[PDB]
Design a protein around this ligand. Sequence first.
Ligand code: MG
Ligand code: MG
Lengths: 256, 249
Amino acid sequence: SNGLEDSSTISFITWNIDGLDGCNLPERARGVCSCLALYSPDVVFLQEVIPPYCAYLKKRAASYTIITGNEEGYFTAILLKKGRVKFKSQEIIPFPNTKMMRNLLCVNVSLGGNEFCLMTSHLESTREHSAERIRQLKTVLGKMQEAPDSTTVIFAGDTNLRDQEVIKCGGLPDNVFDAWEFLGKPKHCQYTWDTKANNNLRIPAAYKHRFDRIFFRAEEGHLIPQSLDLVGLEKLDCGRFPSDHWGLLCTLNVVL
Amino acid sequence: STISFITWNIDGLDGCNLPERARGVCSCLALYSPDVVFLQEVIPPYCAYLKKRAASYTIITGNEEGYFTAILLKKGRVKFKSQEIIPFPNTKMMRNLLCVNVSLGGNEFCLMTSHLESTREHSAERIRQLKTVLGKMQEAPDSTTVIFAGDTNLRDQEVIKCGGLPDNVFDAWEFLGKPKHCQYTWDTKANNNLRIPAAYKHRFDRIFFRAEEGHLIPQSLDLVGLEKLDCGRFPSDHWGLLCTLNVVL
Ligand SMILES: [Mg+2]
Ligand SMILES: [Mg+2]
């Protein structure tokens, strides 16, 4: 449980849970929920949620308030641990040129005696949509910069980024950091989508990417990543994983 | 005091109406009787045809199998001195750089052609090949006039990525003031050979030259091959370029 000693921390998971794959979806949702029960994160950032998946989450993850990025199709969601996180508002920023109904979902909350703006997105998919993905990244980073200086901004989501693309933007702006980079680029959680290790898409080839990423903007030294680890690497009863992506579990300390 | 030439990707890879289209190319060449013809996408039976139909030209080829370039040199006007083939080590499309050393009277030339790597997706390799071409153009003695004519598949931004043409290498179309009437050499609005139901146009076919100041002066540039044949298609999906130049001492 979250005691006094652990009160300066925020923990979260971000995970594209592949709700577009209808096969074995209820069992796979139960697998995601088992992971949430194991770690009891304060916040969960999800991508590729669909409406019946919301019902699975209400059943097996009932301690979370669910905020969604849309009502129909597939969309992102932010889950907030009841009793820990106080919800203040939700904002949705459009991506006017998306061809995949993507957008930027933000929720303003209070947690641990601190004000946060929590953001997620599922940026335009595939190599061929690089230009639009880069435009969306700019929208995300601009929104991170625009937040009031007092609030702690955390983005976590499925960026679909290739390393060359971040550079095409000129890189993360000066007060914005990537949690994996901050922690010294640890190899154990570098790749979040890996067709050698994960067979869910049935791709007969071996490719791996760091698609899922965490960005944060805080006043100097005020937000310090403590750990980053993969989740969802256990096969379920059906012999498949919860998703084609691995999830990321992150803890950060909010410091005076 | 002149040299005249045509450069033309004649699409030997399109087997449909190929015999009629090859005869169409040559009917076209017969109208202009150029000193030199640079061809791309020649295939072996097309080459066999040219060896008979164009027996009045010396025919130099870039390969013997698949598809390849050729340079045709008018006998009695052009003295053939040597050929050189330079590989593009990373081509995935058997492309290369074909060069011939020739003389027209007292004037020595190095004439070059290539069919640079095709498609937007192969931009990086195409740029590497362009660099190989430009490097080679610099190698000739200063008194030798160097002309490259071929299907470059270039986008203008790719030439910028390359660093631009060097100060001593000129594009004949640019030299002539960027005339609009012969700008685009591949145009799916005007050319139906690929049955592309949309309008796209590119200046893929280009002419570069290096000559001592004022010793090679482009005079004209025109598109050729714009007449539909009996079968209702064109000799190629590309138009050819006919260029006339003076060599002025
Ligand atoms: Mg997916
Ligand atoms: Mg072609």
